[PDB]
Design an enzyme around this catalytic site. Structure first.
Site, PDB file in Angstrom:
ATOM      1  N   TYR B 113       0.807  -1.210   0.000  1.00 32.80           N
ATOM      2  CA  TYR B 113       0.000   0.000   0.000  1.00 32.80           C
ATOM      3  C   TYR B 113       0.845   1.267   0.000  1.00 32.80           C
ATOM      4  O   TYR B 113       0.296   2.366   0.121  1.00 32.80           O
ATOM      5  CB  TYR B 113      -0.952  -0.009   1.198  1.00 32.80           C
ATOM      6  CG  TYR B 113      -0.418  -0.761   2.394  1.00 32.80           C
ATOM      7  CD1 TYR B 113       0.379  -0.133   3.339  1.00 32.80           C
ATOM      8  CD2 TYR B 113      -0.716  -2.106   2.578  1.00 32.80           C
ATOM      9  CE1 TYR B 113       0.867  -0.821   4.431  1.00 32.80           C
ATOM     10  CE2 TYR B 113      -0.230  -2.802   3.664  1.00 32.80           C
ATOM     11  CZ  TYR B 113       0.559  -2.156   4.589  1.00 32.80           C
ATOM     12  OH  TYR B 113       1.041  -2.849   5.675  1.00 32.80           O
ATOM     13  N   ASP B 114       2.162   1.134  -0.125  1.00 38.82           N
ATOM     14  CA  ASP B 114       3.045   2.278  -0.259  1.00 38.82           C
ATOM     15  C   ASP B 114       3.137   2.712  -1.720  1.00 38.82           C
ATOM     16  O   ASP B 114       2.632   2.049  -2.630  1.00 38.82           O
ATOM     17  CB  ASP B 114       4.436   1.946   0.280  1.00 38.82           C
ATOM     18  CG  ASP B 114       4.898   0.560  -0.117  1.00 38.82           C
ATOM     19  OD1 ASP B 114       4.645  -0.392   0.648  1.00 38.82           O
ATOM     20  OD2 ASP B 114       5.514   0.422  -1.196  1.00 38.82           O
ATOM     21  N   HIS B 150      -4.395  -4.356  -2.641  1.00 33.67           N
ATOM     22  CA  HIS B 150      -4.778  -4.044  -1.271  1.00 33.67           C
ATOM     23  C   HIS B 150      -4.935  -2.545  -1.044  1.00 33.67           C
ATOM     24  O   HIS B 150      -4.913  -2.090   0.102  1.00 33.67           O
ATOM     25  CB  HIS B 150      -3.763  -4.627  -0.288  1.00 33.67           C
ATOM     26  CG  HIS B 150      -3.880  -6.107  -0.105  1.00 33.67           C
ATOM     27  ND1 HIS B 150      -4.844  -6.860  -0.740  1.00 33.67           N
ATOM     28  CD2 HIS B 150      -3.159  -6.973   0.644  1.00 33.67           C
ATOM     29  CE1 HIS B 150      -4.710  -8.127  -0.392  1.00 33.67           C
ATOM     30  NE2 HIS B 150      -3.694  -8.224   0.446  1.00 33.67           N
TER      31      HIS B 150
END
Lengths: 328, 314, 275, 272
Positions: B113-114, B150
């Site tokens: 999720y970065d 995600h």
């Protein structure tokens, strides 16, 4: 010929604004290479391909010796072939399929119109090869996908997706989705094909042609669409070619369900059996919209030329031979 | 190198040449950039609701349950605040990101999720259509995707935008139908290489569970880059290869210390990159096979211009 | 405490009408020194890799390692380790009789042993023991001893029981009748959990099925926690909001960290004495 | 056929008999059928009744179309005008209960069986909503899997339109679980149903999921005018149904439904 072109021009001028916007969006998607046609049995019927009710009739005669007094329901179309498959043999089912479907039929003008729309993909529930023949004729190559193994090894970026299989490998009932058992076990037997179809629907602009509004596949796709987050997908377009104009209640119901319906019977007047007339009316409306035959006035040529030329404002100079490709 | 390792490298490089290679990037590549790991977030949550760090070790269920219990008890605002204070950080892009990009993947699927993959793509000048929400699938600007299955924090540092707690994983198929379908379709139509995963990851085993439902030999086995310190066991390798994985073990290829994760990743990534120009021709019959593979299609043509033969052999 | 008082009252109430069902876990079998699953995984791991785990087993490794052994070593070897580990004669702990002393309508168990069956036979209360699919239709009685993970009555073979990861993944397909019967019993009865942890795979599996049910359409099952540490307030209200009425034995009485028998006994006899 | 009657009597005496009652028994009591409800919805939708015969989807779609575009209040109002009536219990309602069934599973949303049980004094636990499953106060159940209008003449309490059938497992998890459990643990006799009915086909799709020989094959009472076509028989015998035909047993008029229903049911009682 020229009489039809004037009538089509007159049809477009009095067209409803909703239908006008639908045509504009379909044409824009076709220009972007994002247009996908979901072709049903009606287009194959326009080529005189044998309909499934003939097969159900043959199975009913083989089951009991007499054609049924009455009309089959939606379940009978699936149940009767299943009863033939179970009570009678597999080989008899496959032989009846072979004798009914091993025929040569020509590609109707609707196939040519669909291909002339420049579809990024073509999804079909038809197990015939008419779309394949039309694509081969018109010079555009489509990776035909009718089995699970065809998904992993697809040659091109554009597919001809037969979600119900076909008879390429053979005229066998295990290569196609006809029986009631095949529809129940479709998601278990066709995971990759169903996933590819849903991905194509999600990532493209879909136009449904050759279907009735109460079609099983249409309502299954609407049920799947209901599971998606609101406003996270583009509403597929539905070309309705039924003889009678769609009821307002049915239209609003199916548009709330997630369809943008272009009803042929509401655009042109035709006979009850003039199905090709309605199909050609809608498809030709789209085509001459793409061919710029409906530009009637000033400040509309300005918009077209601006849409073609405004991106070139970023460049300092454009070659004259470049401008030929700008206007295609 | 082992013969099967060389075969795996051959197929991966061929798919990269054909533009059919997709990298499935896990948390290991982000950890190589010292990005905050999830167990630190679980640690902070446990310190928050319970008041003290856990005495023992977090089980697989705990990593999802503790954030879930924190979200239920302390609410959404505290969860998002801890997420923001832990994840609103600027981390560089490790050389593994550049190595993955240098293979020219068709798409990049990630559970991270970065924005490290996004930062690497923006630095390399590779344009990807970043898909992290459901509305991004239809509004994708290109056919090459950066599929964050995600989610991410591009909209904001909230738990609604990401799949972190156990309720997000329970309702993932319902909450991410388009994204999951796109991921499965990309898997079914491309050559998949897994990097940054531990062979026991939840995502890896969920993908294998989906794979077991597919028709036999109707799909290509994805490639798994294993960067654990110890070499893989023979039984584990046999089990996971029968499960539909072609595992390339970094620990078997090279020797390195336990904590030299970067060197293990770089060994496999460089060996993949340095084999793009390689043709793996050593013995004489490998010469005949390659030239035949290049020339045999030309047997359909009566004559070939000699000036055209330089294009046949690149 | 005030809240605990009705928890016993509701259980004793449901026990009087024959409307009480006990969901028995592996902790009750552990009280009679039945072979735990971790030492089976240890044997499977040792045969797989020639060495002990020298570490901590995750929840997935409890199911994965037997699956790895089953795939790469076969089923005859898998059943042989099951045979020499589970073909043992173990006694019944007092908790087995205390569960039966409440006269439950049904007994649902994830255990594959016959410890409950022998306790039922000794007491004389006949239960229709159901653990295979063919057992659901041919049940002579309406009182069920439902072994939702099978047993070894047919034989010490792996397909009779739910141990490996594949068994848990394909449970609904292989046991629709057993799973359907378990959920119907849960929905229409008062359920008390003994022998389970709050993190148990099965316990959270019914909790995932519970959230699918309409709100206030079911009785919240009773959970008897025998973990040595007292329950945390955040953990307690989280699981109570998940549809659980937890009766923590650590809070009820004070005891050592290793003596499980009286933690089960503290709640089991207290339910009995209120009857 | 003689063996089929033997098993039913054997199960009836042991107390393991359950009757799955359909609309045909309710129609036999002159209860308003669903097709005339679709007629009113279609007339109030398109301004005129439709000329052709309604398909299986149409029986579910027009009520769904009416609900969406005319609202819930209009949907319930037509429900009240058609279903707030009192109908006598046909003698077959008595013959169903005369066999002492352990449970009664009904797709009917009427109280005709509820009235029938109350007249005979037998107390059945009537379960038609999600809440009724946990609050049942007896072992024997009157399971209305499609709800009823006991709470009120509202569309939310019954399974009528196509959304209800689509979301049935989601909104009735306890009802469908109880229905499936009763089928597994009892011998089932279907009455008031056609072979091509959706509910029968749904159960036959759940039956094929079960492993072979793990279940008792349900009994089917067929009351269609024409005798069962032989080839159709083996198809549904293999699907899990042991069919008994009133058309084959006795010669009957095409419209004389009562005697066909009564011929098989009186045969069951006289065999008891």
């Amino acid at each position: 010929s020229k009489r039809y072109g004037e009538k089509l021009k007159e049809v477009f001028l009095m067209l409803d604004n909703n239908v006008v916007e639908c045509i504009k969006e379909i044409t824009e998607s076709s220009r972007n290479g994002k247009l996908v046609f979901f072709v049903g049995a009606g287009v194959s019927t326009l080529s005189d391909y044998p309909q499934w009710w003939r097969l159900v009739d043959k199975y009913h005669e083989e089951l009991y010796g007499s054609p049924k007094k009455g009309n089959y329901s939606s379940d009978e179309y699936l149940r009767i072939p299943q009863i033939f498959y179970n009570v009678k043999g597999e080989m008899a089912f496959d032989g009846i399929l072979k004798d009914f479907f091993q025929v040569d039929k020509p590609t109707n003008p609707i196939h040519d119109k669909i291909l002339a729309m420049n579809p990024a993909h073509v999804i079909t529930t038809n197990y015939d090869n008419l779309i394949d023949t039309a694509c081969w004729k018109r010079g555009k190559y489509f990776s035909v996908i009718s089995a699970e193994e065809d998904v992993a090894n697809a040659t091109s970026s554009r597919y001809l997706l037969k979600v119900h299989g076909d008879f390429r490998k053979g005229f066998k009932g295990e290569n196609v989705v006809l029986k009631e058992d095949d529809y129940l076990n479709y998601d278990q037997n066709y995971p990759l094909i169903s996933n590819l179809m849903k991905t194509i629907i999600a990532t493209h602009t879909i136009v449904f042609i050759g279907y009735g509004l109460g079609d099983y596949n249409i309502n299954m796709l609407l049920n799947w669409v209901r599971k998606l987050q609101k406003d996270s997908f583009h509403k597929p377009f539905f070309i309705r070619t039924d003889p009678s104009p769609i009821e307002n209640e049915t239209l609003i119901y199916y548009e709330n369900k997630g369809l943008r319906i272009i009803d042929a019977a509401s655009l042109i007047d035709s006979n009850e059996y003039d199905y090709l007339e309605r199909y050609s009316a809608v498809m030709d409306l789209l085509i001459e919209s793409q061919e710029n035959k409906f530009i009637t006035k000033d400040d509309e040529v300005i918009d077209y030329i601006y849409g073609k030329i405004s991106p070139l404002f970023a460049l300092q100079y454009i070659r004259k031979i470049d401008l030929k490709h700008v206007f295609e």
